[PDB]
Amino acid sequence: GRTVVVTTIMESPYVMYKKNHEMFEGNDKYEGYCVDLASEIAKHIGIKYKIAIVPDGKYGARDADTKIWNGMVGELVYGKAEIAIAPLTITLVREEVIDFSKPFMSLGISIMIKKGTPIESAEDLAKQTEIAYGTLDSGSTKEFFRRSKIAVYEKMWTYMRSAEPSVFTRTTAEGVARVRKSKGKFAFLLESTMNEYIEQRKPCDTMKVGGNLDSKGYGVATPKGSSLRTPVNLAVLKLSEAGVLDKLKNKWWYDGEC
Amino acid sequence: GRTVVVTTIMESPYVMYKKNHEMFEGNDKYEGYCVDLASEIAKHIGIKYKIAIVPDGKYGARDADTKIWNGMVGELVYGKAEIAIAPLTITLVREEVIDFSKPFMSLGISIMIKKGTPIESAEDLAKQTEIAYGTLDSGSTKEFFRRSKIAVYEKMWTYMRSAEPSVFTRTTAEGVARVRKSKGKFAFLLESTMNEYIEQRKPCDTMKVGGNLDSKGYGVATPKGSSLRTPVNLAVLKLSEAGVLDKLKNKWWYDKGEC
Ligand SMILES: Cc1onc(O)c1C[C@H](N)C(=O)O
Ligand SMILES: Cc1onc(O)c1C[C@H](N)C(=O)O
């Protein structure tokens, strides 16, 4: 049939450029967990597809002033893509406007610090003001803190909401770079999958501290009314039960540069 | 509105009889994680309901001979209930015949042994014949071994399917009893949630060994075409993000240090 448009995002090790990607066309320019997942799903449900990187580089939330959805979620809602295959977190606010498959990977919000930083936990962050901390803007992590009725997270939100200059970044890379270049005066709140990948690679100057703040999952997303909803959901469960999801995780998170 | 029939199963600490249960009527006879979850869901989607314990006491599988679904799955498929709220595992074969909400709890298949048993892993079980081992009948754990293409689990399946006496069990309670009564000559394959709960309570003679064999979840189930599907799904995610599922898990699994 038609070539299905798959929206995704540049985020290591989910979607990355190959070395010498310039020598490849279309999908063959990319590699990573979600590139592999797309291939596996497409094989199961029998579709041709084209990876399209989300133009605004965002995951998906409502613009504060217009309320229009941005990022990958927006691409699905407004007709520009037919499937999102990415580290896109399954949340209520998103499930109300798009459909998610059952989860293909588990994660939680976690704390990234530069090695040496005097911080062991969220409580440690919330106590003080010397070390600044923040999250991605326009995503599930920022929403977690704004929503929370837990004392420590409420305190963290009240700080982050009003901090100057902004503690919110547009990409995870931006947050991680800030951690590395701030000499221990910045901690970044990001999902455990990313945190753990990054701490096992050069320059080996960051680490995850404490446990995860919550527990949830990533899912493959389709626009409401899509004929791909059920096929995609069953495909994810098939891959789960055949051990393929586990195999791909071990492949892309394999450790020992550090 | 109507009183919705909720199918569930007696399984501690998801669904248990209250002390002096004969002194209570209807829903008030029960307590547990899934009883609380049922109340929270009904409240968020605005329904009245009646808890009805699954008559055959099974989770649910498609009978090989008759091709008829049993357990809670069957109750939904054949119109005997409208929602299943229980530690029912989300699987491909079940998803083909009923709908599941996003997961409310994570788990994996695990190994239960009697303390002292010389077993530390699935591989240990497989390369050995002295100690027997099996699973529940009529659920996801048995199907896992039946379907596995992994060497170690295939070997385990070939043994179990022909073992004598039969190693398959009716309820987790009976599996746990067989582990306790077999003085170390039986190991029981059950999900981590049950394994961990049982390990921390008297008589404190069992334990989980090794990591989980897989990673999956439980979901709330509804029959295909149900008008309750979406409200149920949104309620589970709302409860999750509100910290309520966390609160319930820590309440019902709280370790009072009996061991
Ligand atoms: C990936 C990642 O890592 N940390 C985050 O906040 C994210 C984005 C998050 N998964 C979202 O869907 O908004
Ligand atoms: C609960 C439980 O604990 N171990 C098991 O195998 C089960 C049953 C399993 N959750 C099912 O849905 O079949």
Curated annotation (Swiss-Prot), chain B:
> Which cysteines in this chain are paired by disulphide bridges?
204-259
Q: In which tissues is it expressed?
A: Detected in cerebellum.
- Segments on the Extracellular side according to the record's topology features: 118-259
Q: Where in the cell is it found?
A: Cell membrane; Postsynaptic cell membrane; Cell projection, Dendrite
**Modified how:** Palmitoylated. Depalmitoylated upon L-glutamate stimulation.
Where on this chain does L-glutamate bind? 87, 89, 94, 140-141, 191
| Protein family per UniProt | Belongs to the glutamate-gated ion channel (TC 1.A.10.1) family. GRIA4 subfamily.
Assembly state and interactors? Homotetramer or heterotetramer of pore-forming glutamate receptor subunits. Tetramers may be formed by the dimerization of dimers. Interacts with EPB41L1 via its C-terminus. Isoform 3 interacts with PICK1. Found in a complex with GRIA1, GRIA2, GRIA3, CNIH2, CNIH3, CACNG2, CACNG3, CACNG4, CACNG5, CACNG7 and CACNG8. Interacts with CACNG5 and PRKCG. Found in a complex with GRIA1, GRIA2, GRIA3, DLG4, CACNG8 and CNIH2.
Instruction: State any further remark.
Output: The postsynaptic actions of L-glutamate are mediated by a variety of receptors that are named according to their selective agonists. This receptor binds AMPA (quisqualate) > L-glutamate > kainate.
What exactly does this protein do? Ionotropic glutamate receptor that functions as a ligand-gated cation channel, gated by L-glutamate and glutamatergic agonists such as alpha-amino-3-hydroxy-5-methyl-4-isoxazolepropionic acid (AMPA), quisqualic acid, and kainic acid. L-glutamate acts as an excitatory neurotransmitter at many synapses in the central nervous system and plays an important role in fast excitatory synaptic transmission.
**Domain comment quoted from the record:** The M4 transmembrane segment mediates tetramerization and is required for cell surface expression.
Q: What name goes with this protein?
A: Glutamate receptor 4
Q: What organism is listed for this UniProt entry?
A: Rattus norvegicus (Rat)
Q: Which gene encodes it?
A: Gria4
Whole protein: which stretch is covered? 415 to 795 of 902
